[PDB]
């Protein structure tokens, strides 16, 4: 009953099971630990970062090793459009003979790989199960390096100080230039040297790379300035990927669009992209001042940025010390940027597939988009939660105020009511009218008169599609016109490739849109606005409100303030995160439902099914869920089973976890404490069991813990059931 | 970089004078015990108790390897594979083309014998109050003192004799595995070569 929460003496003195539960959930909140200083905080965070990167590299190495050992990578190379990639083998003693037979792939039961790693590794120039093994070996070596570094930087003479940790200019210069630019430069080097010849049949391994010229002229044009030579003779339109037939000699080109065979971006396009990004980031990494008297001091930049007329208060004067001294502000900024970035990855890796033969891998396309959108929602909610935490525990009004006037951040708490009221107005506006149009379509179609539907053509979005060259909406605007200056400017660089790809019905590049797209985009906007409303309200109201003008004194996460003053359930800022998690899950569900139904109709060919039935709710319920759930639920029946049996089991498992979350959310404490007391009496008053007694007094889960557990069940069930549905439906419908 | 100190003066390494002399074995033992208590206090890790137990097991296993070689040579060690219909799909190793290669029955029998011996060990582990030599160290008990580079030359059924023979057997197993890995033959093939041919005859 002691010594487990070593970091908290208050918990270690708890005589109940709450100590164990809270010991888990407070282990990473280093700022709240006993005998805590800032130096130890930054050093522990640094070591934890090292361990985390080691974990990531070990996970990647495991994926590589299991593809190399139990996969069919080599067979998939020779026939990427017919051979289904294998993730890893299965050894489960609970299998019957039927399950073994159904999951049997080649030599052993195995799982199909939906991560798209086969296409990614094939694109970057891997052709052998020994290339994957080398990658796994190297990644385990890197993990060992990172673990050694993490141990080393906790040693006495190697523990960095607060000044080093808060040295913003040095870290920015190095991160930008070194990390981004130099990693892009090295990736361009690999892309060219290995990937470009490997796509043309020439093997460039760790033996013949110092003697195989990536370009026939060989670094002469680069130093000579004749950089056009690297773009001459690109890959033809009859080039077979991985073979020298119809190949070229160029290494950096503009082509635009996709490879005619793999239906993916040109490797020479991506090498040029990464070279340009490398140059730009290396240049941008010299901005801030270091030991050589030139550069920028960001404190001065922030302080000097006050509009002269005066509408942002005193400007950004106090922001430097605010961000530097708070790890939650930086964490929130990083999480918001990462969420936007992974939303970008999801939205671009389906419209512009970058890996060979990934466009025809429909289950992996759906899985990748869903995975990245869910990660995006999680990251955004985390960014807002950490902003709220910064408000609660790191924000100092004195730093952000100069002689009564407030800086740009402190002024966000002055018109907080205006911000929240207008977020509420936008949410109500969008919800009222999107639901009104959807229900109008529902009722009108149900009454057998679909012509009375309200169908709004998304002209604004179709205008953008025409601006990028789509000649489908008869707009003749910028790139849909051959005479506009936008078209004449790039008529010789990348329009022929771009136009040939955007004006193609088999791509996902700028999918044609209609009224259903309009309505679902408005639903998405409503979801985004409502999630933002909840999170922003929790962040701004974190330090106090009218119901609790001292909420900052109770911390970020506390159960309530009691039944007084009318009742104060879910009044903390943590509860705002807890409520906004449901809205994030709902919004990501809407986004992924829209994407998956649109792409299922596109792949099956019945795009008229979406364009007609997507305007009313029953259309969704009947033609997406009810229609495509048939292959999934018949993964096992009283007659047999298929390789989709695991997905049906996961479907039911997700439903069960969802409803257990419903348990933990609807039923609150107090009802579970008295029942536990009855159980305690029963155990204490029964023979043959009195010999065994608990060391920690069994008590009901706390209010905040119960909310967390219900949210965890809700989210896990949500994710599992939707993953099972999307994967099984795609597999069982599209062969 | 220049206007500040990367490492504070208050956080600097101090040379541990407590390990002066203290040959690498003593230094390693002290470092392990200080760094990992509650597993060192149990006798686990680089400890004389663990060394003695592992030596006993290595000697018994040299005996077991000789017995296994004899059984393989003398027509024992049942033939074929396990019945998947009888023992489920967990005994299936691979399916090449329409035939299920299962775990060899000889491997199953050897695993059952090893299970017998390991069960005996587990009973002795959860029988601490009735066994002559316990597996772990009692709280308070102190680990027997390391024997050193060369244990005392005391012939017979002595602690030093068992200690020396356990070290020799463990080194022999290490050498056997190293020879098998370097040259590439089976473990029993290496033992057969190292016995002239008198085992697999």
């Amino acid at each position: 009953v002691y010594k487990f929460p070593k970091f908290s003496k208050a918990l270690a003195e708890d005589p109940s099971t709450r100590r164990i539960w809270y010991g888990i959930a407070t282990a990473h909140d280093f700022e709240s630990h006993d005998a805590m200083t800032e130096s130890k905080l930054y050093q522990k965070i640094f070591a934890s970062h090292f361990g985390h990167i080691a974990i990531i590299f070990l996970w990647t190495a495991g994926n590589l090793f299991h593809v190399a050992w139990q996969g069919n990578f080599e067979a998939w190379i020779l026939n990427p459009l017919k051979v289904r990639p294998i993730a890893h083998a299965i050894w489960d003693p609970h299998f019957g003979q039927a399950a073994y037979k159904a999951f049997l792939k080649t030599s052993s039961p195995a799982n199909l790989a939906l991560s798209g790693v086969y296409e990614w590794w094939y694109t970057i120039g891997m052709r052998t199960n020994n290339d994957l093994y080398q990658g796994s070996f190297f990644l385990i070596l890197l993990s060992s390096l990172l673990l050694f570094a993490g141990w080393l930087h906790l040693q006495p003479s190697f523990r960095p100080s607060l000044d080093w940790f808060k040295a913003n200019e040095y870290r920015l210069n190095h991160h930008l230039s070194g990390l981004f630019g130099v990693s892009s430069l090295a990736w361009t080097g690999h892309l060219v040297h290995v990937a470009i010849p490997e796509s043309r049949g020439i093997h460039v391994g760790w033996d013949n790379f110092l003697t195989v010229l990536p370009h026939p002229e060989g670094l002469t044009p680069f130093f000579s300035g004749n950089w056009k030579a690297y773009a001459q003779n690109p890959d033809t339109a009859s080039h077979i990927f991985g073979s020298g037939e119809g190949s070229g000699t160029a290494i950096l080109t503009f082509l635009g669009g996709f490879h005619p065979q793999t239906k993916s971006l040109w490797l020479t396009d991506m090498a040029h992209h990464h070279l340009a990004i490398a140059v730009l980031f290396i240049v941008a990494g010299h901005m801030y001042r270091t030991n050589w008297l030139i550069g920028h001091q960001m404190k001065l930049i922030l302080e000097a940025h006050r509009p002269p007329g005066g509408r942002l208060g005193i400007g950004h004067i106090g922001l430097y010390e605010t961000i530097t001294n708070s790890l939650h502000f930086q964490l929130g900024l990083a999480l918001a940027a990462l969420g936007v970035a992974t939303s970008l990855t999801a939205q671009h890796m389906y419209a512009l597939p970058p890996y060979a033969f990934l466009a025809s891998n429909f289950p992996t396309q759906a899985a990748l988009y869903t995975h990245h959108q869910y990660i995006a929602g999680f990251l955004m909610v985390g960014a807002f939660a950490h902003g709220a935490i910064f408000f609660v525990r790191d924000y100092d009004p004195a730093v952000n105020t100069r002689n009564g006037e407030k800086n740009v951040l402190a002024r966000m708490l002055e018109h907080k009511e205006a911000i929240i009221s207008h977020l509420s107005w936008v949410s109500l506006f969008l919800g009222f009218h999107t639901l009104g149009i959807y229900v109008h379509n529902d009722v009108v179609v149900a009454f057998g008169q679909p012509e009375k539907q309200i169908l709004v053509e998304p002209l604004f979005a179709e205008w953008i599609q025409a601006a990028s060259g789509k000649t489908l909406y008869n707009f003749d605007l910028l790139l849909a016109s051959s005479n506009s200056p936008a078209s004449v400017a790039s008529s010789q660089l990348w329009l022929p490739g771009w136009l040939s790809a955007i004006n193609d019905g088999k791509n996902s590049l700028f999918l044609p849109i209609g009224p259903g797209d309009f309505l679902v985009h408005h639903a998405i906007a409503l979801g985004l606005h409502t999630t933002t409303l909840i999170l922003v309200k929790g962040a701004l109201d974190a330090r106090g409100s009218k119901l609790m003008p001292d909420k900052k004194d109770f911390g970020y996460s506390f159960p309530c303030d009691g039944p007084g003053r009318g009742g104060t359930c879910d009044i903390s800022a943590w509860d705002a995160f807890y409520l906004a998690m449901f809205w994030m899950l709902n919004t990501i569900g809407w986004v992924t439902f829209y994407w998956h139904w649109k792409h299922l109709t596109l792949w099956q060919g019945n795009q008229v099914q979406f364009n007609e039935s997507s305007n009313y709710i029953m259309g969704w319920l009947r033609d997406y869920l009810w229609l495509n759930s048939s292959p999934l639920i018949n993964g096992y029946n009283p007659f047999g089973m298929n390789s989709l049996s695991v997905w049906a089991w996961m479907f039911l498992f997700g439903h069960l976890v969802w409803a257990t979350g419903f348990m933990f959310l609807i039923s609150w404490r107090g009802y579970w404490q008295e029942l536990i007391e009855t159980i305690v009496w029963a155990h204490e008053r029964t023979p043959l069991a009195n010999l065994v007694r608990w060391k920690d007094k069994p008590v009901a889960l706390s209010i905040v813990q119960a909310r967390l557990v219900g949210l965890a069940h809700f989210t896990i069930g949500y994710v599992l059931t939707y993953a099972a549905f999307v994967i099984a439906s795609t597999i069982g419908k599209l062969g | 970089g220049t206007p500040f100190d990367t490492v504070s003066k208050d956080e600097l390494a101090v040379e541990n004078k407590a390990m002066a002399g203290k040959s690498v074995f003593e230094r390693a033992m002290a470092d392990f015990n200080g760094r990992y208590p509650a597993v060192a206090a149990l006798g686990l890790g680089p400890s004389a108790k663990a060394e003695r137990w592992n030596g006993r097991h290595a000697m018994f296993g040299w005996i077991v390897l000789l017995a296994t070689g004899y059984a393989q040579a003398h027509g024992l060690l049942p033939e074929g594979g396990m019945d998947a219909k009888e023992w489920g799909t967990w005994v299936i190793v691979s399916t090449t083309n329409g035939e299920q290669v299962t775990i060899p029955a000889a491997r199953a029998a050897i695993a059952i014998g090893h299970l017998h011996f390991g069960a005996v060990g587990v009973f002795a582990a959860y029988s601490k109050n009735s066994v002559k030599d316990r597996l772990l160290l009692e709280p308070g008990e102190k680990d027997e003192a390391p024997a050193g580079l060369f244990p005392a030359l005391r012939p017979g059924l002595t602690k030093e004799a068992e200690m020396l023979n356990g070290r020799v057997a463990m080194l022999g197993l290490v050498a056997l595995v190293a020879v098998s890995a370097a040259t590439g033959q089976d473990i029993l093939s290496v033992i057969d070569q190292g016995l002239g041919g008198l085992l697999l005859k």
Binding site: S48, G51, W69, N129, N130, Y133, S144, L147, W151 | -
Partner: peptide, 30 residues
């Protein structure tokens, strides 16, 4: 198909990465 030697040494290297992980884990304290 990878050999027994390839998998074995990868397992051995994985063990070394495990001992480095507990050293980091124990250094981040109990």
């Amino acid at each position: 198909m990878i050999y027994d030697s390839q998998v074995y040494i990868a397992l051995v290297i994985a063990v070394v990465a495990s001992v480095l992980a507990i050293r980091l884990g124990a250094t981040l304290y109990n």
